Every structure is written in C-alpha cells, then in structure tokens.
Amino acid sequence: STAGKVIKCKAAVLWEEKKPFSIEEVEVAPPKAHEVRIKMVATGICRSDDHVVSGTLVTPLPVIAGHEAAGIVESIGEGVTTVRPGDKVIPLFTPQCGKCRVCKHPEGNFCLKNDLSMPRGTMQDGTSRFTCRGKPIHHFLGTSTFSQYTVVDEISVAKIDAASPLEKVCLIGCGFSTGYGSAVKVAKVTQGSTCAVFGLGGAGLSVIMGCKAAGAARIIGVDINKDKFAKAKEVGATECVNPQDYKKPIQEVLTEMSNGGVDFSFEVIGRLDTMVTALSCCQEAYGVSVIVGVPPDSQNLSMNPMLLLSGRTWKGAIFGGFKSKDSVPKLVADFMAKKFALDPLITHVLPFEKINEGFDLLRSGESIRTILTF
Amino acid sequence: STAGKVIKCKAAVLWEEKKPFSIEEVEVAPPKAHEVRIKMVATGICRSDDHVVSGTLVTPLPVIAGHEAAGIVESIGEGVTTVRPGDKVIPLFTPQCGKCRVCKHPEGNFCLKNDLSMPRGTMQDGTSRFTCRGKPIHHFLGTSTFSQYTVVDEISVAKIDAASPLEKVCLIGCGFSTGYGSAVKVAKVTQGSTCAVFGLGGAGLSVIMGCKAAGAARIIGVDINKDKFAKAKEVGATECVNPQDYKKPIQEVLTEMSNGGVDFSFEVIGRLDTMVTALSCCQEAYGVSVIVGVPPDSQNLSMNPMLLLSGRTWKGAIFGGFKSKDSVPKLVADFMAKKFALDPLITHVLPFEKINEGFDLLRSGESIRTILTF
Ligand SMILES: NC(=O)c1ccc[n+]([C@@H]2O[C@H](COP(=O)([O-])OP(=O)([O-])OC[C@H]3O[C@@H](n4cnc5c(N)[nH+]cnc54)[C@H](O)[C@@H]3O)[C@@H](O)[C@H]2O)c1
Ligand SMILES: NC(=O)c1ccc[n+]([C@@H]2O[C@H](COP(=O)([O-])OP(=O)([O-])OC[C@H]3O[C@@H](n4cnc5c(N)[nH+]cnc54)[C@H](O)[C@@H]3O)[C@@H](O)[C@H]2O)c1
Ligand SMILES: OCc1c(F)c(F)c(F)c(F)c1F
Ligand SMILES: OCc1c(F)c(F)c(F)c(F)c1F
Ligand SMILES: [Zn+2]
Ligand SMILES: [Zn+2]
Ligand SMILES: [Zn+2]
Ligand SMILES: [Zn+2]
C-alpha cells in the first residue's frame, strides 16, 4: 500500500530555464484534506509547457511542469467527495471551485483560484507536495503532470469515464478542448461562415475541428510551415496559406480572399504581430477575433483602436471558455460517443523517459502532439 | 419654386483647422438622382464636429461639418422613393444602403458606403454640392448639417414622424442613439449588472440612460470634471468618481469598488489611455468593454493581450450599432411615446448664427448639448 505514505517516484524536473528536463527520483507527499494523489498514465507535450522552458511564460522554478494529462486516483485526502481511488481522472489546469464570482457566472471559466495570473507554483494551501534532492519543487498550474505521481486540489481534477483510453483523452485536458471551445463557445462560429485560423499546431487544428463542427463554409488555415497544411485540410481546412509566399501582408490577402474580411479569426500561435493581423483580417463591422496563443511575458502590442470602433469584437480565452470540472467529463463522454476525433492530433507516442526527445520533436516543427506514456 | 435650382443660403464653413467657423453664403446645387435636398431646422453640436476643428478627426478641408440634425425635405432627385418634399427627416452620418454585406448582416451597421473610415468629403458620386466664394467645399460624413440647406444621398436620410419636435429629435441623429445603443445593443447590458462609464458628456449620459433602461444595478460615472456628476446621477448613475481624487490608477479603484471588476465598461471620451483603462477595469474573465470615443488620428494604443486571454471582450461601435435608416424612425416613434427622454441632454439653445459661441460652451466644459436653430 502507498496510501498515507510518501511515494518515491520518477519525475521530469525543470531546474532552470532553457535546459533539458532532468528525469530523476522525487518524493511525493500524501494528499492533505481536499487533495487527490494521481498515478499518471499519459501526458501530452503542449507548447505552453515549452513556454516554461523558453521563458515565454514565467512561473517559479524549479518546477514539475505538465498540464495536459490523464491518470488513475491512488488516494484521496479527508473530505474529498468527487473522486475515489481507482477512478480515471483528468487534472484541470484551470480549476473550478464552484464558489467564486467567475464560477457562478454563466459565461466565465477563469476561476479565481487559478495559478495562471500570478503564479505561486503551489497547492491551494501555499505549500508543495514535491521534494527532489532534499529541495522543495514547485507545482505548475495546480497540475504538475510530468511525474509518475502528482497531488492536485480537488477543484483541479475531474472524474471521467472508467472505460476511457487515457492515452487519447489526456488531450481533453488542454489542446483539444481549448481549440474546440474557442471556436464553438468563445467565438460562437456560425453555419456558413468564413473562418481564418493562424497556427496549425495541436490547438489550431482543434480550432479547425470546432469551426467545421459549427458548420463554417470556409476555413482558411495560416501557417509559415507548409508541412502543417495536409493535416489541417484533413480536419476541415478548405484552403491553406503561407504568409511567406506573399509580397502583401497576410491580413490584406485574407481580406481579399474573403471578399472584405472573415467572419471569425483565431490567433493560435502566441505572437503580438499575428494577434493584430488576426484582428485586422476579420470584417471591420461584424467580425470576431479570438486570441488563443500565449504571448511572451510582459510584452504589449500596439494597435489602432479604429479597428474596434468600426464594430469588430476582440476577445481571448483560457481552455476554450469551458468551465473545467463540468465540461471535461462531458467532453470525454462525447469522445466515447464518437462525436469528435482525437487521433488526428497525435503524431508521436513515446515513453515518459523520452520527454526531452518529445520536446525536440515539437521545437523542430515535426510533431503536433507527442503523448508520453508512463 | 426652388426645385431644380441652385439655392443660395448661409452655412458655417470651416476653412482651416483650429479657427472659428465662418458663417457666410454658399451655393447649394439641386439634388441629382437618388439625392435629397433638406432645409435644416435644428442641428446639435457634437464633440466629433469639434474633432474636425482640432484635427483629432481628419477629413478634407474646407468643409461644412455637422452630422446631428433634423430638417424638412425641400426637393428630391430623380428616383428617390423613401422621402418626399415636406417630410421631416434626420440625416444619417452612417448610411444604410441596404445592399452591402454589412447591411445584410443581422448585427452589422457600418455600411460600406460610409465616408468615415477613409473620408473623401464628397457625395457618393465623388463630387460636391457646395460652392463658397466660387470654390468647392467638402461635405462631412455625407451629411454637412451646418448649413441652412444640405444635399444628401438617399441612403443617408430617414423619414421620421410628421409630428416630431425637430429641436429635440435631432439628438437621435447622433448622441442619444450612439450612447443608448452602445449599452443596449453593443454591450447588451444585463439586469443587475455593474457598469462603468468613462466620460459624462452627451454620449456618456446616453450610455447611462441605456444601462439604466437595461436594468443595471450600479452605474459608476467617471469624469475629471466633477461638474458633470449631478446630471449623470439624474439620468441613472449610482455613484461618480473623479480620477484626479485618487492616488491609485482609476482601473484599480474601479476594480476595488466592484469587488473584482465591472460587468460592462464604456470609453466615451476619445483617449488611448482611457480605452486601455476601461478595458482593464472590467472583470478579467467575463467583462465586456465598449469603445465609443473617437481616437486622435492615426495613433495606436499599447496594451497587454493577457487582458483579453483571461476572457475579456473588447469591442467598439459607430452609432450605437444601430442600422441607421431602419432604426432612426423607430427611435423617434419611441421618443414620441415617452420611452426615453432627450431634454436631460439639452443644456443650451442658440440660433445657428451663434455657432461659434456654441462651440465655446462645449470647449469650456459648460454644455452637454447646444441645439442650434436655423
Ligand atoms: N488559451 C489557452 O488556454 C491555450 C491552450 C493551449 C495552447 N495555448 C497556446 O496556443 C499556442 C499554440 O499552441 P500549440 O498549437 O500547442 O503550438 P504549436 O504546435 O507550436 O503550433 C503553433 C503553430 O504556429 C505556427 N507559426 C509560428 N509562427 C507563425 C507565424 N508567424 N505565422 C503563422 N504561423 C506561425 C507554427 O509553425 C506552428 O505550426 C501557444 O502559444 C500555446 O501556449 C493556449
Ligand atoms: N462612436 C460613435 O458613433 C460616436 C458618436 C458620438 C460621439 N463619439 C465620440 O464620443 C466622445 C464623447 O463625445 P461627447 O459625449 O459628445 O463629448 P464630450 O461632451 O466632450 O464628453 C467627454 C467627457 O469626457 C470627459 N473627460 C475628458 N478627459 C477625461 C479623462 N481623462 N477621464 C475621464 N473623463 C474625461 C470630459 O470632461 C467630458 O465630460 C468623443 O470622442 C466623440 O467624438 C463617438
Ligand atoms: O496551454 C494552456 C496554458 C495557457 F493558456 C496559459 F495562458 C498559461 F499561462 C499556461 F501556463 C498554460 F499551460
Ligand atoms: O460623432 C460620430 C462620429 C464618429 F463616431 C466617428 F468615428 C467619426 F469619424 C465622426 F466623424 C463622427 F461624427
Ligand atoms: Zn472559482
Ligand atoms: Zn496547454
Ligand atoms: Zn450598406
Ligand atoms: Zn457625433
């Protein structure tokens, strides 16, 4: 039995920025009240994890990163009512406390208990459950999935279908749900519309999936890497364009292609310039542009507010606008009912021990999602 | 007797920026096909007219400005079907051609025939109906209401109730409809919500009217001129704040006052800094901010897109989002049925010949709207 005891297990520790993960033994404390300890089964490599490595995202180090995952509950602390030992679960990098003003709002999902805005890198109680080489190690987004075992707050975990294939549904923990929701929930793409999607990685492909599910007539994929185009078309893009192929700025190209601007545009990269381009390419009177990409820390963009005064709407969202704990189990159930596909996002499957090689596949442009298996 | 003939009349010509208007004789050509010549009855002094004088808004000079007005049709050109001589009308500074993709869109109102985005200062056919001292004079927004007679394109005029009081309803041609629609149609203010309104001039007061009509529980007016507060409270503000009273930035003050950010905010001034402040003060996950104010020409704002990524919506609109020709007659009918009030916006009345004194009143901070009578 491990319940009530410290577990020594393997994890991928990031000691400093811009260095490889160190795969080594950590100690994982048992869960306190209202906490859940999870044996990880699969975790995805998301670009946002790479942002921690690259310094695009700032969070306290050293850290156990990872936020897109699925596993099995090993034990629960006093007072947990929503999961039990043996349950399949997905950690929620955006919590759902159910009590704050955001959780109570019909359209809000960025729960005030999140550790994204002003990261502390701890459990809700301000402490860590991880030690390595005698040193405390930070959590990441209340998830920390790059470990054989993690401990999360109850508000940061959802129970999912016992029959779920964890090596696929982990993607409901970030990339699929983010893109899909950004289209269907945040933008509210309409039937017959024209959409433009900037960035054709895992999140952008999931945006395309959502635009197609919503009935868009045209879905224009935009990427500087033309190797991304074939898979974009497979999941619903009607055309793809590479800005590098044109003498004009791509917002002008897209405005021309759409006979005056697109209905819906999405920035799914994380660059200030493409955020402004994406806004500009939507129709000036009624267009909507949604920011999904995470830009570099503390940098501001510049834009002309006449882009908004004419009638554009500009918004962003975390996790596709989904209330996390309510939504994740329903998304898994929908997947099990064949309502959407996940395989198109998965290009590589590697053992956890190959985490660094997985990050190299992402950085080279060669992968969409690598799933790591414990 | 004047049909088909040039009319000589008085107009207020702006020859140069940062100079008084010149009240002097102009020649007004008869209407060509699908044009309407209007004998003006009343016109308001809007801050956007002052922006032409100050160079905040760039439009070709020399010009006959004026865009908020009401009058009586003197004659119609060939093919006009929607008004007749003797009809009361309001010129539409945002046209409604009824045929472009925006006019056809259920939400859109910024008709592609507008002369706002890239002003030419002409009629739709690229020519002018005005001569002064033998020189052609530009139009403004297709309306040019600072003249005893103007000529407008048919898509830029709406017929209104024959019993309408023109010295009141002219305000439906800009300030009232802009602010009221910005609240009720663009933001879609909800019952029980908390709103913040930056700028308590004619447009901002009309935003407050709309927020109150929509059932907001709290409406916080924000102005650096505390003399504006009494009227703001009369039309529905629950509290007023002057940024100059506070050591902290007003976005922080408003976030504190609203226990974590407002539901809806409105920028109704025309400053880049207050556009960003108004965005920031809305709740980060579900807040909505609407830009109403007109920015200084060709200047960009700077902002951190994390404000949007958390969930905020940012939008702007012209003329409160109203499809102009459809909406203006209905707004007049509603005014006649006492569904809203216009008198709170009218602080001064002057003859047209005292237009410069009317601009002095606006610039000093003393007036909300001065209505000029011809
Ligand atoms: N808002 C959220 O909740 C959330 C969730 C998931 C991902 N993200 C962010 O979304 C972004 C995309 O993530 P991902 O899909 O996993 O990453 P990814 O797989 O790296 O995809 C990004 C794509 O952008 C392409 N690209 C790079 N520069 C340009 C350019 N100038 N023009 C056009 N295309 C370009 C690039 O070739 C690649 O295919 C990242 O910034 C993530 O951090 C945000
Ligand atoms: N979008 C549209 O269709 C549209 C229509 C009508 C008006 N406008 C614009 O809306 C703006 C307001 O017009 P208005 O109400 O006629 O003008 P106004 O009467 O000049 O009102 C502006 C108010 O802003 C106040 N103010 C100035 N600076 C600050 C500051 N730093 N903080 C807070 N308050 C400040 C000022 O004291 C005044 O009461 C102008 O830029 C107009 O051009 C836009
Ligand atoms: O990929 C999801 C994701 C985000 F959208 C962020 F904004 C962020 F800061 C982060 F750490 C993260 F993992
Ligand atoms: O006051 C309405 C109004 C505007 F909202 C503008 F954006 C503009 F350019 C203009 F000339 C105008 F009169
Ligand atoms: Zn919450
Ligand atoms: Zn992610
Ligand atoms: Zn039109
Ligand atoms: Zn105006």
Contact B196, B216 (CB under 8 A): no
Domain boundary among B317, B334, B350: B317
Q: Is it true that the peptide bond before A62 is cis, omega within 30 degrees of 0?
A: yes
Q: Do B169 and B160 contact (CB within 8 A), yes or no? A: yes
DSSP A155: G
Q: Give CA–CA dist A362/B183, Å, rounded.
A: 45
C-alpha–C-alpha distance, residues B80 and B88, integer Å: 15
* Distance of alpha carbon A333 from alpha carbon B353, whole angstroms: 73
Structure tokens at B223: 């102005």
Cβ proximity of B153 and B122 under 8 Å? no
Please name which of B158, B151, B156, B161 lies closest in space to residue B77, comparing C-alpha atoms: B151
A97 counts as catalytic: no
Q: Is A290 in the pocket of ligand 1 (CB under 6 A)?
A: no
User: Rounded CA gap, B36 and A57, in Å?
Assistant: 60
Distance from CA of A217 to the nearest CA of B (A): 16
Are B334 and B304 contained in the same domain? no
Ligand 2 centroid, distance to A126 Cα (angstroms): 46
In the numeric block, which tokens belong to residue A226? Answer: 């033309």
Which among A304, A311, A316 is the nearest to B300, CB-wise? A304
Tell whether A202 and A310 lie within a shared domain: yes
* 8 A C-beta contact, residue B147 and residue B14: no
Ligand 1 within 6 A of CB of A276: no
Token pair belonging to B125: 């056919």
Cβ–ligand 3 contact at A257 (below 6 Å): no
Residue B122 — left, alpha, or beta (φ > 0 → left; ψ -120 to 50 → alpha)? Answer: beta
Same domain, yes or no: B290 and B331: no
Give the CATH number for residue B340: 3.90.180.10
Residue B278 distance to chain A (closest CA, Å)? 13
Best of B309, B313, B315 to substitute, by most chain A Cβ atoms within 10 angstroms, is B309
Nearest CB partner across the interface for A310, out of B107, B117, B275: B117
CA distance B288 to B284: 9
Say which amino acid occupies B82.
Answer: T
B325 shares its domain with B310: no
Distance from CA of A177 to the nearest CA of B (A): 15
Task: Give the DSSP H or E segment for A334.
Answer: helix A324-336
Residue with tokens 């960035």: A199
Is the separation of the CB atoms in A3 and A85 below 8 Å? yes
Tell me how far apart the alpha carbons of residues A338 and B187 are, in angstroms, rounded to a whole number: 37
Give kind and range of the element (H or E) at residue A102. helix A101-104
Distance from CA of A127 to the nearest CA of B (A): 25
Rg for chain A, CA atoms, rounded: 20
Give Cα separations from A28 to A9, A127, A132, A194, B105 (angstroms). Answer: 7, 12, 9, 49, 57
Residues A266 and A221 in one domain: yes
Among A34, A46, A139, A367, the one annotated catalytic:
A46
Cα gap B67→B340, rounded to integer Å = 21
* A227 lies in the same domain as A121: no
Give contacts of A315 with chain B, Cβ < 8 Å. 308, 311-314
Question: Which residue of A lies nearest to B102 if distances are taken between CA atoms?
Answer: A285
Q: Are strands B194-198 and B218-222 parallel, antiparallel or unpaired?
A: parallel
For residues B141 and B193, membership in a common domain is answered with: no
Residues B168 and B183 in one domain: no
B268, B308, B322, best to mutate vs chain A, most A CBs in 10 Å? B308
- Number of domains composing chain B: 2
Put simply, the answer to whether A311 touches B318 (Cβ < 8 Å) is: yes
The H or E element that residue A196 is part of is strand A194-198
Q: Is the CB of A116 under 6 A from ligand 3?
A: yes
Q: B252 and B138 in one domain?
A: no
Q: B187-192 long-range CB contacts below 8 Å, 24 or more apart?
A: B187/B264, B187/B266, B187/B288, B187/B290, B187/B315, B188/B214, B188/B288, B189/B214, B189/B215, B189/B216, B189/B263, B189/B264, B190/B214, B190/B215, B190/B216, B190/B263, B191/B215, B191/B216, B191/B217, B192/B216, B192/B217
Orientation angle between helical segments B272-281 and B250-257, nearest 10 degrees: 20
Helices (H), chain B: 47-54, 101-104, 166-169, 175-181, 202-213, 229-234, 250-257, 272-281, 306-309, 324-336, 355-363
How far is Cα B152 from Cα A222, in angstroms, rounded to an integer? 43
Establish whether A302 is a catalytic residue: no
* Catalytic one of A48, A128, A206, A265: A48
Q: How far apart are CA B155 and CA B147, in angstroms?
A: 20
Q: With contacts defined as CB-CB under 8 Å, which chain A residues touch B193?
A: none
Q: Which domain holds residue B217?
A: 179-317
Last residue of some domain: B317, B347, B365?
B317
Question: ω before B95 within 30° of 0 (cis)?
Answer: no
The two tokens of residue B58 are 């760039």
The amino acid present at A82, given as its one-letter code, is T
Is A269 buried (19+), middle (13-18) or exposed (0-12) by CB count in 10 A?
buried
Helices B47-54, B355-363: axis angle to 10 degrees equals 90
Ligand 4 pocket, B116 CB below 6 A? yes
Chain A residues in contact with B109 by the CB 8 A cut-off are 285, 311
3-state secondary structure of B91: strand
Q: What angle is formed at CA B31 by the lines to CA B26 and CA B35, rounded to 5 degrees?
A: 120
Atom of ligand 3 nearest to the CA of A141: 11
Residues 6 or more apart whose CB falls under 8 angstroms from that of A339 comprise: none
User: Considering every ligand atom, which ligand is closest to the CA of B208?
Assistant: 2
DSSP B112: T
Measure CB to CB from residue B309 to each of A259, A311, A316 and give the nearest one.
A316
DSSP assignment letter at B296 = P
Chain B residue with the nearest C-alpha to that of A187: B313
Q: Is there a single domain that holds both residue A305 and residue A159? A: no
For residues A50 and A359, the answer to whether their CB atoms sit within 8 Å is yes
Closest CA to A229 of A361, A348, A368: A368
Q: Nearest 5°: phi and psi at A91? A: -65, 150
Measuring CA to CA, which residue among B1, B8, B41 is closest to residue B133?
A: B8
Integer CA distances (angstroms), B30 to B34, B74, B122, B210, in order: 11, 10, 15, 39
CA dihedral A270, A272, A274, A280 (to 10 degrees): 140
Distance CA A312, CA A306 (A): 9
Which residues in B lie closer than 8 A to residue A286 (C-beta atoms)?
102, 105, 107-108
Q: Which of B269, B296, B317 corresponds to the end of one domain? A: B317
Q: Residue B42: name the closest of B95, B88, B2 by CA.
A: B88
- Sequence-ordered alpha helix ranges (H) in B88-201: 101-104, 166-169, 175-181
Closest CA to B199 of B181, B185, B179: B179
Indicate the Cα dihedral angle B267, B270, B276, B280, nearest 10°.
-20
Verify that A123 and A268 share a domain, yes or no: no
- Whether residues A162 and A25 fall in one domain: yes
Query: How far does CA A9 lie from the centroid of its chain?
Result: 26
